[PDB]
Design a protein around this ligand. Structure first.
Ligand SMILES: Nc1ncnc2c1ncn2[C@@H]1O[C@H](COP(=O)(O)OP(=O)(O)O)[C@@H](O)[C@H]1O
Ligand SMILES: [Mg+2]
Length: 379
């Protein structure tokens, strides 16, 4: 099987990837188990490749040792350095094997990837004096030939995966390409509102909040000071909310997190007991808590890059939390700056959760065009 473009967002909450324009995502969990635990782990055969996604049991050889991993939703009932940790690498292998099983032939045991692309979080890059070298090591982790075994009964095989070319971009910053261009590499009219304003890109996530200062026209950051990461996370805010106000309704922060993004955006946020179908309106409690958090976010962003009083900044909010907070952001910015500045200067991205990934996708299409241009000039 041949893959032209593969773009990966190793999130803290979800692994997400686009493979030749095809989207799917997996829970980030990777649990390492022993050989005997993996045997007699999985009991009944599966035949439909789609079922593999929730049943990812793989092995791969690491430092000449064959090790066994539960990946994604199968790892569920059981901030890492993205470069030196095996977790992203193992997730990538399982993801690729899943896509092969879903879209490819049973007897095809080989996958070639022309162009692999991922990225690194700002909090990790800022620890080093040079971003480029860490990004190069990240890319090198995926370049070349790898093998993985699928041990899920019914879909067993050892897959050889060959990555011909690989690159690593900067999270949050790279998302600007999803605003600048569409996948046909046309300039977006949507980006014109940022033609004359420096923009603070606010990547609001579950575990970090990363901000990039983009000079007018969504141009590259001027220096290292234009990249900032914060850690007083959204998940801690939810788990404090759960233990204080909602202990009755959620036994884990993951449950509360799932209920919120599933239910934010409608007028009533209703919790549904499965046994008796009884109803609990949790709307007031939740929007109130989200507004609190948003007030902290707006203030952080405002204070992160001290806008000089002869400059007007605009703010573009994204990430999965940005998506959830969209309503809250509109309310809070209107209270704080007035309606006019709220609407024109505080923008929540559409596809906020997927913007980084989409930025990779745009770069991979430009790269793909560049390649074909180069190869035809080669005569
Ligand atoms: N459809 C969705 N699936 C999963 N999470 C979502 C979804 N929509 C919004 N979210 C929110 O996205 C957050 C994860 O944000 P993300 O940008 O992935 O940051 P991180 O990678 O740090 O978790 C979750 O806390 C969740 O509340
Ligand atoms: Mg992210």
């Amino acid at each position: 099987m041949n893959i032209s473009r593969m773009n990966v967002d190793f999130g803290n909450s979800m692994y997400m990837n686009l493979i030749d324009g095809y989207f799917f995502e997996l829970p980030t969990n990777v649990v390492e188990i022993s050989k005997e635990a993996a045997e007699g782990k999985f009991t009944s055969i599966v035949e439909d490749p789609a079922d593999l996604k929730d049943r990812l049991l793989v092995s791969t050889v690491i430092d000449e040792t064959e090790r066994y991993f539960l990946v994604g939703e199968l790892a569920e009932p059981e901030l890492h350095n993205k470069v030196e940790s095996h977790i992203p690498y193992v997730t990538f292998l399982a993801a690729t094997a899943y896509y092969q099983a879903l879209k490819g032939k049973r007897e095809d045991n080989e996958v070639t990837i022309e162009y692999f692309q991922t990225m690194l979080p700002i909090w990790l890059l800022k620890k080093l004096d040079k971003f480029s070298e860490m990004q190069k090591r990240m890319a090198s982790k995926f370049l070349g030939t790898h093998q993985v075994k699928v041990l899920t009964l019914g879909l067993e095989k050892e897959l050889t995966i060959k990555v011909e070319d690989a690159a690593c971009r900067i999270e949050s910053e790279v998302a600007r390409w999803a605003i600048k261009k569409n996948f046909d590499l046309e300039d977006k009219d949507y980006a014109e509102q940022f033609k004359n304003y420096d923009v603070v890109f606010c990547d609001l996530g579950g575990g970090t909040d990363d901000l990039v200062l983009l000079p007018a026209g969504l141009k590259p950051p001027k220096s290292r000071d234009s990249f900032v990461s914060n850690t007083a996370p959204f998940l801690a805010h939810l788990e404090k909310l759960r233990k204080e106000k909602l202990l009755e309704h959620f036994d884990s922060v993951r449950e509360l997190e799932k209920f919120i993004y599933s239910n934010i955006g409608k007028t009533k946020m209703e919790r549904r007991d499965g046994n008796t179908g009884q109803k609990f309106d949790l709307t007031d409690i939740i929007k109130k808590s989200l507004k609190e958090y948003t007030e902290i976010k707006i203030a952080q962003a405002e204070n992160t890059f001290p806008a000089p009083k002869d400059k007007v900044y605009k703010y573009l909010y994204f990430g999965g939390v940005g998506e959830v907070l969209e309503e809250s952001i509109s309310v809070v910015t209107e209270e704080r700056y007035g309606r006019d500045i709220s609407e024109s200067n505080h923008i929540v991205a559409e596809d906020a959760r997927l913007l980084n990934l989409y930025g990779l996708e745009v770069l991979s299409r430009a790269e793909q065009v560049k390649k074909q241009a180069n190869e035809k000039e080669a005569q």
